[PDB]
Design an enzyme around this catalytic site. Structure first.
Site, PDB file in Angstrom:
ATOM      1  N   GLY A 157       0.772  -1.248   0.000  1.00 35.63           N
ATOM      2  CA  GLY A 157       0.000   0.000   0.000  1.00 35.63           C
ATOM      3  C   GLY A 157       0.812   1.313   0.000  1.00 35.63           C
ATOM      4  O   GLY A 157       0.549   2.193  -0.810  1.00 35.63           O
ATOM      5  N   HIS A 205      -1.848   6.057   8.231  1.00 32.79           N
ATOM      6  CA  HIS A 205      -0.903   5.037   8.651  1.00 32.79           C
ATOM      7  C   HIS A 205       0.539   5.528   8.440  1.00 32.79           C
ATOM      8  O   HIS A 205       1.361   5.508   9.374  1.00 32.79           O
ATOM      9  CB  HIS A 205      -1.140   3.729   7.875  1.00 32.79           C
ATOM     10  CG  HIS A 205      -0.216   2.613   8.260  1.00 32.79           C
ATOM     11  ND1 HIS A 205      -0.586   1.607   9.138  1.00 32.79           N
ATOM     12  CD2 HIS A 205       1.051   2.334   7.872  1.00 32.79           C
ATOM     13  CE1 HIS A 205       0.428   0.767   9.284  1.00 32.79           C
ATOM     14  NE2 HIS A 205       1.435   1.184   8.529  1.00 32.79           N
ATOM     15  N   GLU A 206       0.867   6.000   7.240  1.00 35.52           N
ATOM     16  CA  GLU A 206       2.275   6.423   7.038  1.00 35.52           C
ATOM     17  C   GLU A 206       2.605   7.665   7.885  1.00 35.52           C
ATOM     18  O   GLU A 206       3.743   7.804   8.373  1.00 35.52           O
ATOM     19  CB  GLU A 206       2.592   6.703   5.551  1.00 35.52           C
ATOM     20  CG  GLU A 206       2.152   5.570   4.588  1.00 35.52           C
ATOM     21  CD  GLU A 206       2.607   4.168   5.005  1.00 35.52           C
ATOM     22  OE1 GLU A 206       3.629   4.015   5.719  1.00 35.52           O
ATOM     23  OE2 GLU A 206       1.911   3.193   4.610  1.00 35.52           O
TER      24      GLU A 206
END
Ligand code: J2D
Ligand code: MG
Ligand code: MG
Ligand code: MG
Ligand code: MG
Ligand code: ZN
EC number: 3.4.11.-
Length: 889
Positions: A265, A301-302
């Site tokens: 992803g 998330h990142e």
């Protein structure tokens, strides 16, 4: 075949303090010059200096500017550069090298590679060694000074970590940029990007220090209009970490970059996050609804990695769940708060209990912190990520928000700027536990078993109520099945969030209560309980376990209707369905085995069907939740409960149950499908890419779910609704019209129409591929052959390959055709893909994960194909290791 063991961790005999890189990109090769400023560590015992370096072509290597000569002073075997200890200095020294690599032909998408017209890196976990020599492990922290040069017309935008400190022209139409990144980092966080990139940008002002942060989001020029949602999500992420965790971004700039070719992803390289395009780019005209939640969660998330993984990093790769489980947990908190829909948490649970529970009962079962690995590219699993996240989330459940926040800040303040291990996190949580319990003798030593013990616990219940005493008891038992990792399983610290529902008025009978189960069994007693309650168990799904609630279907129905907790209502429905499925499955199996000419099936509970109607007809109830209650449990959830599963008999079972319920509720479904149209398909904000309405998307999910049920049922004249649906501006709708039209003669008419709508947008075409792949078609093999010849061809783009094949593998009747033709087809694709991308070849093995759970004929067919794959002479290390473990060889 080297096996790395967790117990074997030892610090390096060397230190790398400074990395100075020059990366010169040319037409047919990329030249990488590197100077490493190094030292001897306190752990050094006069060993050879051994660098990782994979697939590098050496032009020269030097120590303190003296050229080393091959054979006499060093050996290189395409994996390790070994400089014999007698030539290794005994104080600070400079190692330098010049190597040639070839991103254009790097189709494995690790190291430095070319994605379409963009040069890009992927270094986690051990890809940096594919770029230049290094001691490629996350505890080798260093400062980076990186210069990139390239043809200016082809590659006008140059990015790496840190601050851009120089930009300069080079003769022959080239140009360079220098990036200096003074804070220490591990090499898996190095990144470089070169391309003709276009961007959107914004300025964010941090909450407390009021620093200006420049935000940039990049893509190829064609898709620059698909970047807006991502930038909004990035802003949202920054605010959440500030508001919940009190954490601000520390750098002056953050870049997000979309590329078309990516193994996963996205990746959290410091200040330079790199994304699969399908997890960064969207527009309302060219994306399905799912893209919007996807981008939100992956951008989040990142971003959350900047603390949990980047500023606090890993001692070694066995600690992976420390950054991934924790960042998924932070990502999930964020997503729940942004979407404000109960289905967000439900979707996480649905994923865990299908895919991760299957992994945890397969031969691949491992704890969230494994004891060994061969292949790091095979380590990034749903166990490490999603079970890791549930383990990280249980700390919050146990501590509550105030002490969880206190414990988390202890972890950050104590480990900022350093490597860490799972124990460091448990220690921080333990300090908060002591404070919460007002007891400095309290500890979480038992909690560590969640990191080391594999397998899913089973928690079961018995109840007792004494009406005269007004006293209620819940007796609880936990059990984990022995497996290849532990012969004896120990009891875990299991937090059980509970309520007690008064069945007469539906009200809560006790305050919020989290039972702490720490033994094999315990009895929890409640006094002053005025009437016999229905227990509401594991609210919010408070631990990652198999729940055996031992409730009647009458009790479960009451909870489904009246309980306050979304998960218990959904789980109660799930349990009613599972009881029915197991019952009908075995009635069908018996008829098959005994070759019966006639037999009986037990009908679906009519009061259950009544409860579904009641909820569906309630205008105050949530559309997303409604879509879950009319859907049977996932096949991969069901298979955890059936031995020797005959997929045909399961297909017949599901079909019977859906038909039973639709025979009663189809008119209700149709009425709702029509009444939901106005709000679900509202176009007011269709041209505002920053306006995203998760409730409205859930209404579309519900409509598209209902349409699917009515189409399969051949509801009178439903094809009319299907054809009108194909005219909707929303891709979720018009792609739905393609897959529900599978049951009608208009499928290929809708096939062509939707292809034409999809073909000119790379990501939309991939969504079209998935829709076709998952189509419930009797001619699906002929259709797949057409996709291969006409659309897929010899693409090496992982998004393309996964879109064509993975959805098909969830086709219960067809993928599991008793001839084995589906198994044969996916193994051929795996073997083909393994020639150029082993990581994705292993992803394509996913359907085989349940092989030993199926009926004996299908076990044999799957095992044959896996052994056929294992016998390919050119099989990758990744694929070999994976299939060897999966087949218990
Ligand atoms: O993209 C994902 N995971 C990546 C991650 O944790 N980003 O922070 C991720 C990143 C890199 C890898 C990875 C590991 C390797 F060993 C490798 F060779 C590689 F090319 C990528 C695997 C997963 C998942 C899907 C999107 O939401 C986050 C979980
Ligand atoms: Mg090479
Ligand atoms: Mg704010
Ligand atoms: Mg996620
Ligand atoms: Mg393409
Ligand atoms: Zn991550």
């Amino acid at each position: 075949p080297k096996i790395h063991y967790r117990k074997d961790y030892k610090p390096s005999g060397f230190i790398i303090n400074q990395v100075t890189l020059n990366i010169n990109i040319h037409d047919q090769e990329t030249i990488v010059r590197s100077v490493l400023d190094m030292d001897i560590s306190k752990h050094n015992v006069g060993e050879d200096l051994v660098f990782d370096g994979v697939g590098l072509k050496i032009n020269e290597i030097s120590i303190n500017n003296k050229k080393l000569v091959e054979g006499e002073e060093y050996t290189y075997d395409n994996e390790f550069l070994t400089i014999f200890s007698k030539f290794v200095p005994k104080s600070k020294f400079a190692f330098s090298s010049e190597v040639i690599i070839h991103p254009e032909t790097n189709y494995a998408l690790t190291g430095l590679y070319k994605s379409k017209n963009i040069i890009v890196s992927q270094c986690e976990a051990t890809g940096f060694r594919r770029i230049t020599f290094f001691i490629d492990r996350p505890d080798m922290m260093a400062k980076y000074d990186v210069t990139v040069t390239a043809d200016k017309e082809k590659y006008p935008v140059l990015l790496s970590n840190g601050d851009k400190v120089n930009e300069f022209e080079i003769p022959g139409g080239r140009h360079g940029a220098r990036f200096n990144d003074p804070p220490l980092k591990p090499c898996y966080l190095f990144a470089v990007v070169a391309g003709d990139l276009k961007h959107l940008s914004a300025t964010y002002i941090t909450k407390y220090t009021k620093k200006k942060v420049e935000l940039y989001v990049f893509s190829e020029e064609k898709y620059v209009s698909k970047l807006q949602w991502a930038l909004e999500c990035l802003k949202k992420s920054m605010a959440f970490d500030e508001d919940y965790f009190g954490l601000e971004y520390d750098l002056s700039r953050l870049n997000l970059v979309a590329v078309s070719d990516f193994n996963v992803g996205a990746m959290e390289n410091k200040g330079l996050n790199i994304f699969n395009a399908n997890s960064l780019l969207a527009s309302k005209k060219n994306s399905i609804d799912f893209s919007y939640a996807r981008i939100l969660t992956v951008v989040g998330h990142e971003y959350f990695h900047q603390y949990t993984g980047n500023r606090v990093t890993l001692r070694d790769w066995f600690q992976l769940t420390l950054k991934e489980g924790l960042t998924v947990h932070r990502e999930n908190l964020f997503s729940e708060e942004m979407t404000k829909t109960v289905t967000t948490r439900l979707s996480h649970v649905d994923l865990l209990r299908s895919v991760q529970f299957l992994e945890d009962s397969s031969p691949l079962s491992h704890p969230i912190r494994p004891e060994s690995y061969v292949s790091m590219e095979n380590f990034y699993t749903t166990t490490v990520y999603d079970k890791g996240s549930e383990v990280m989330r249980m700390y919050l459940t146990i501590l509550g928000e105030e002490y969880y926040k206190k414990g988390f800040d202890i972890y950050i303040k104590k480990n900022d700027g350093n490597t860490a291990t799972c124990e460091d996190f448990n220690y921080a949580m333990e300090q908060a536990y002591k404070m919460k319990k007002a007891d400095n003798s309290a500890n979480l030593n038992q909690y560590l078993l969640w990191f080391s013990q594999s397998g899913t616990p089973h928690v079961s219940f018995k109840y007792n109520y004494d009406a005269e005493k007004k006293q209620y008891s819940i007796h609880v038992n936990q059990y984990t099945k022995p497996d290849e990792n532990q012969k004896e399983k120990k009891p875990l610290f299991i937090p059980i969030s509970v309520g007690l529902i008064n069945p007469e008025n539906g009200k809560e009978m006790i305050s919020q209560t989290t039972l702490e189960l720490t033994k094999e069994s315990d009895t929890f007693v409640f006094n002053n309980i005025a009437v016999k309650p229905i227990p509401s168990l594991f609210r919010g799904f408070s631990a990652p376990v198999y729940i055996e609630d031992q409730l009647t279907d009458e009790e479960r129905i009451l909870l489904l209707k009246y309980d306050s907790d979304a998960f218990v209502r959904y789980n109660s429905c799930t349990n009613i369905y599972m009881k029915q499925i197991l019952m009908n499955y075995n009635e069908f199996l018996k008829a098959k085995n005994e070759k019966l000419e006639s037999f009986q099936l037990t009908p679906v509970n009519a009061q259950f069907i009544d409860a579904i109607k009641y909820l569906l007809e309630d205008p105050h109830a949530d559309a997303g939740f409604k879509s879950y209650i009319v859907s049977l449990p996932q096949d991969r959830y069901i298979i955890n409960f059936v031995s020797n599963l005959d997929t045909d008999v399961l297909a017949d079972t599901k079909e019977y149950i859906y038909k039973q319920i639709g025979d009663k509720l189809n008119d209700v479904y149709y009425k709702m499908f029509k009444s939901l149209e106005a709000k679900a398909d509202d176009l007011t904000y269709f041209n505002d890419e920053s306006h995203v309405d998760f409730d409205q998307m859930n209404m579309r999910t519900l409509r598209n779910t209902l349409l699917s049920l009515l189409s399969k049922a051949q509801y009178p004249n439903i094809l009319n609704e299907i054809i009108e649906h194909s005219k909707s501006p929303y891709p979720s709708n018009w792609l739905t019209s393609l897959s529900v039209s599978a049951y009608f003669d208009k499928y290929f008419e809708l096939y062509d129409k939707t292809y034409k709508l999809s073909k000119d947008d790379e990501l939309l075409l991939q969504e079209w591929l998935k829709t076709v792949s998952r189509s419930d078609r009797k001619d699906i093999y002929e259709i797949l052959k057409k996709l291969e010849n006409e659309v897929l061809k010899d693409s090496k783009n992982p998004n393309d390959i996964r879109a064509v094949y993975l959805p098909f593998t969830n086709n219960l009747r067809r993928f599991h055709d008793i001839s084995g033709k589906g198994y044969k087809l996916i193994a051929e694709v795996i073997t083909k893909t393994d020639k150029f991308n082993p990581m994705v070849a292993t992803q394509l093995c996913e359907p085989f994960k349940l092989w030993n759970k199926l009926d004996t004929k299908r076990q044999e067919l799957m095992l044959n194909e896996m052994n056929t794959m294992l016998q390919e002479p050119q099989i990758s290390n990744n694929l070999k290791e994976y299939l060897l473990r999966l087949t218990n060889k």
